[PDB]
Scaffold this active site. Structure first.
Site, short mmCIF file in Angstrom:
data_model
loop_
_atom_site.label_atom_id
_atom_site.label_comp_id
_atom_site.label_asym_id
_atom_site.label_seq_id
_atom_site.Cartn_x
_atom_site.Cartn_y
_atom_site.Cartn_z
CE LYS A 196 -12.22 -3.36 -9.88
NZ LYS A 196 -11.12 -4.07 -9.85
CG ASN A 245 -8.11 -4.98 -3.00
OD1 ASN A 245 -9.33 -5.44 -2.86
ND2 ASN A 245 -7.53 -3.93 -2.50
CG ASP A 264 3.17 3.16 -9.17
OD1 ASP A 264 1.44 2.14 -9.49
OD2 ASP A 264 2.96 4.41 -9.54
CG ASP A 277 -2.38 1.13 0.92
OD1 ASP A 277 -2.14 2.04 0.91
OD2 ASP A 277 -2.64 0.13 0.74
CE1 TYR A 295 -13.46 0.13 -9.37
CE2 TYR A 295 -15.75 -0.26 -9.37
CZ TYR A 295 -14.27 -0.93 -8.79
OH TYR A 295 -14.34 -1.49 -8.18
#
Lengths: 282, 284, 272, 282, 289, 289
Positions: free
Chosen positions: F174, F98, F71, F37, F170
């Protein structure tokens, strides 16, 4: 050694030609006494000049039993007389095959009321009149005996009656009406023991042979088919099929609020016909 | 701007109940509604429905034609064209019932039901089809046309005591399917609604009653709109909470005779094992 | 007029529970019921007493349904004393539940004997008599056999390798007997019996109706009658199928074929 | 590297036909196969199959246990553990046929068919289940185990003249379903093959070849199939099919009142078998 | 009277193959076609641009067309092409997003440039053209207070719906186009525009026109594209339509085939194996329940 | 002995919410989790990096974890992160992609950066990590001559499967991941790795007790991810699995629902309207045929 319909009396309307003639032969072949109803003129004219008498002759020459009848099935009094004549002369009327019919094909904008009225009269009123006539007799017998009685009605629908067909607003309406008439009669006559079904009939084998459905009509009229009622059975060419009717294929709820006609387009598109996508929905 | 601005709609039997709901709904969306009915009030009931429509800001005229009578129906359609410019929409809703088991039913009971339901819907359909087709041939292009007929559950499934009403409402399905095919090329659509003692305008527009006879009226209004020009020959059930598309007769079991004649002395076993499934087939 | 007036019916294991309900139900509808059971001064007599006190006809029978000689005698003592045997309801059974590693061969054999051999013996006994009458008359005759399966027989259940095999065997026995007895007019069906939803007699009217002249067109069927619901069941059917192209299967490729074409645990990808 | 390297498999009735095909296939993929059969060829036919397997580069030993006999079955499994280390796979295929209509069938015809098919398959299953469960308790972990039983079309649907064979092959399905549930926790799987005098090893593609399902039996016995249990898999000719079993196709409620046999005829017709119509039901 | 009389259509990658067939078909039914392509012609004669050759074929057959040489991956060039359509031709009614390339390799042999480039032409190109006309159409709707005419037909493929070995980039790109199509349908519905996706599956199509029916002809779906772009198809949006060879098919998308509840308790990963086997994939039996 | 004892797993975007739940779950079952993260913490204490906080929670619960700040859109950093896993921890067995962002706007208000950035993090990031481990796993399989262990779990969403207003970027991203997952499943099947996609649908999941059930808990699907990453799920690949709230569902994809043949003649756009109506969408009746 024992025919399916031995001892039974059967009325076949429009039995002078084609499909109805096949029915009359088939029922008589299985032992029934067939009342051959038809109004037509024999092509030869030799004899009585009546085509129904020709069918009776064919039945008798093959060892069967038959009598001719010239009743207009669209006429109330004549139908009553035909049924009265069956009980008094033959003891009973066990089987009714409503096959009489005519066609008056044309697109509706060229169709006269006579074209419409006449097709509705012969197909629907005729089948209703004969059905009511035997229903009254059968119910009277059942009420007197306190038991179920024998009864068979086979009506005649067609593909145009189930699906519509260009140039047949009258014929399609009539053959559709016969389906609803059949379903209702089945429910009304169930308790006294009679069945009411609808046929969709359309060494050598011709797929267009008009008598290919006649054994099915004969079997439905037999004691073996006492548990089958209100059914639409298609017997055309090589195939015998059981049909089932109207059913929902798509359903949507308004949430116990009135529908909004300005929103029904999107609801019809996404929730009924599937011409638009719904998107993600929780 | 309402969905039906500029349209003229005929609703038969619009004096009470379902037809009254339709007439109110079509007028609410901008149509000029011809309120057809023969009944009286406690004063003709069609005039009262017109007044309700007008009081809500709509446009309506009364009509007292017997939809079973050929001359009156043809005359009503001529009047619509001459006085209102055109007849775009026909909602065939007029009907009667004469319920009894067939052994207690008179031929009048049968004839009268068949006449109002089937002959009436056929008469109005022919009258507008002729007008619409004439306009289409003259212009060489498609024209506007909507016919919504009325069937019912008894018409689709039968119902004890309703040999006449069931036969009538079944006939309307075949009439609807055929009219769709005949009117397709000029651009008109023909569909059937299955809609199922307080009048609809007397019910609060906010409360929801599953027995409200007007719950399907917006569906009728939408089918009559320019948005529904691609839908024809369909049977649509709009009763209470649910809107459903129905599809019709289909085979559920099929058997071949091998291109040899059927034997009635063999059909019993075939019906049991291959059609109704009351007997097992065994290994095959 | 009862549904079963003039008919003679044998119910095995009719001393308690489901079988007693069947015996009572058939007798209520006019049948003379042969109440067969071995329990304790004998429980079959006690059930006969209940039937007669309700106005019905019943007789006791103490045959071990697993024994061939006793079964043949019981059917003869039905034909000779009562004229004919029209209906056989095979319900007699026992349970000996345990996981297979704890189960004895006797636990297995005895359950298979009472359930499967018992139903086969009675079926053969009436089939022979019924078929003889058809040959003499040259026409079809009356016959009803109702066997008893259960959910464990259709789906398996932990601790019941014997009981599940027995109740499964009865399904195949029923399907085969239906085919064998069709021509003489007898029917063979199987009930799955499991207001109180736990009432053991809730399926008894269904057995009674299947044994009646109204049910002569139903044979080889499995009918579930448990609690509130009456259900018709249908059996084994393909849910996924793949062809080898008329070449032998390769066991080193079946894993991928099983995953993508049978169970759907792997995707197939684009396929022309 | 074979699929079944290091494994020991028992095939009952492996002297001819389907069982011989299984024995060959398992050995082809590396298993040491215990070829069980009681028949003669000159010599014992199980020895003949062992020789065929070895001539193809495989490993096999013969066994002459009567699988219907409890003590001999227990001995065969003990012999497998002591001589070969373990018994990983059991293919229950031994069987006989005594086809006759039931009225011509003897109790010996019935008893013998039930004994070899069902008791034999139950006996071998119990024997290995005990061994596998003992090993799992000692290690505290799951172990390897495969049981493949043999059903047939007559077992799933019945067939004229096969009251005994159909009962047996049906029983094996319930035995398979139950064994899957009982052995799941220790890691063994139990499935049922439906496989459908020229021997397989002397035979191109023939749809009647008895060994066409044998590769499926081999794969089900492999480490690749550890997630599959209690399934009925049909491998006949050209097709491989997964079957699913009994299910309701029509269901009706009594409204929490007892059924009435005098009304069930109408309910059976309209709500179960569909031989009568229901009519409109609001 | 052609279906598309008075309409202006943009077809990206219309110099060869499928896109050339679309350009020919739309023009045949009366549309003025903006033939977009960057490639050169074999002869190099004239301008050397293959898009000009397609325009010449369209015009000699009685149709109307203009060429365009915009890189559909470039934001500024796309915005200019749409402006040009409005200023020179009045309006842009139809966008057929067909431009694309392939860079096939298993992922371990594939460069990021091969991945990026395939995503750029297919997905970014279709998004860029869609945004440009969406802005124009919405401005026109706000001005008129009414619905406007609008058609977007995107191009997906079998690899986009199911995956295919060696095509992680192409499969991802053609899948993205489906979600892009579904979303654009929802976004443009209120102003009346439709957005659909065609799945259409050397010798150029105009050289095969009078030829005998070939199931492998890449232009067999062009009449379907032409009809989707017509006034007759205003009620169809967000749909994926497969037109390959002999068959025209409507496809529907993702749906649950097995479902199980945890009873409002957390899932247990040590118990999910049996649940997956018995309740989801059906590899183990449930037994009597 | 946990389901994932001895395994090493990378979870991208594991600092908050769903990704945090996955990281906790994998560590609970014995895996060493690489908590990736880029975000900062609320306190800013020490490293001030939220990934370090998740590592602390994992270790405080008895698990093994290391932080990572790569990254995922950057090729060099992703390849290095996978190298570090091999050199410091021995192997990378599991990758849970994720990481993602959202930039919701109707397309006419959306910038190319809003579109590009969402496509980069979701699709390029998932493609980059997958390619990196595919290279490692494939090299290991060639050296050993046997199959190796490998699990990739990607993340799709309802908008990716069905579209959603304001999410052209998005939804495309996805959706692209589904095609990426289907393709990776095919490419990695032979060496033994599986590739699946989870559809998982402020208090962090570790602030809840393990005995409460909240239908909005972002970690409710994490046991499913852990099971898919476990040796028990080696026969499952290329699947789309929805685990939201109370329900676990298996989804299946695109399929024809209506089909019509042209009789081996070219389609006619002037006839397709009636064909679409009667034979595809069923908006008109066919009549007797």
């Amino acid at each position: 050694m024992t025919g399916l319909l031995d001892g039974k009396v059967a009325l076949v309307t429009g039995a002078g030609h084609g499909i109805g003639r096949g029915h009359a032969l088939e029922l008589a072949k299985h032992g029934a006494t067939v009342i051959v109803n038809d109004l037509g003129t024999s092509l030869s004219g030799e004899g009585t000049g009546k085509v129904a008498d020709e069918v009776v002759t064919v039945i008798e020459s093959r060892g069967g039993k038959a009598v001719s009848d010239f009743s207009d099935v669209g006429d109330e009094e004549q139908v009553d007389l035909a049924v009265e004549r069956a009980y008094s002369q033959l003891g009973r009327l066990d089987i009714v095959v409503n096959n009489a019919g005519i066609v008056r094909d044309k697109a509706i904008w060229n169709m006269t009321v006579d074209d419409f009225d006449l097709v509705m009269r012969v197909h629907v009123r005729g089948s209703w009149l004969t059905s009511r006539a035997v229903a009254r007799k059968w119910r009277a017998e059942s009420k007197e005996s306190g038991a179920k009685v024998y009864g068979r009605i086979i009506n005649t629908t067609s593909g145009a009656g189930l699906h519509g067909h260009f140039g047949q607003t009258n014929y399609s309406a009539a053959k559709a009406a016969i389906v609803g008439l059949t379903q209702t009669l089945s429910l009304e006559l169930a308790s006294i023991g009679a069945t009411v079904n609808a046929i969709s009939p359309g060494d050598e084998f011709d797929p267009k042979d008009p008598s290919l459905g006649s054994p099915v009509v004969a079997w439905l009229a037999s004691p073996e088919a006492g548990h089958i009622s209100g059914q639409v059975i298609r017997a055309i060419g090589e195939h015998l099929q059981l049909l089932k009717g109207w059913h929902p294929v798509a359903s949507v709820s308004n949430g116990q609020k009135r529908w909004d006609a300005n929103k029904l387009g999107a609801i019809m598109a996404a929730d009924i016909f599937g011409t638009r996508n719904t998107g993600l929905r929780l």
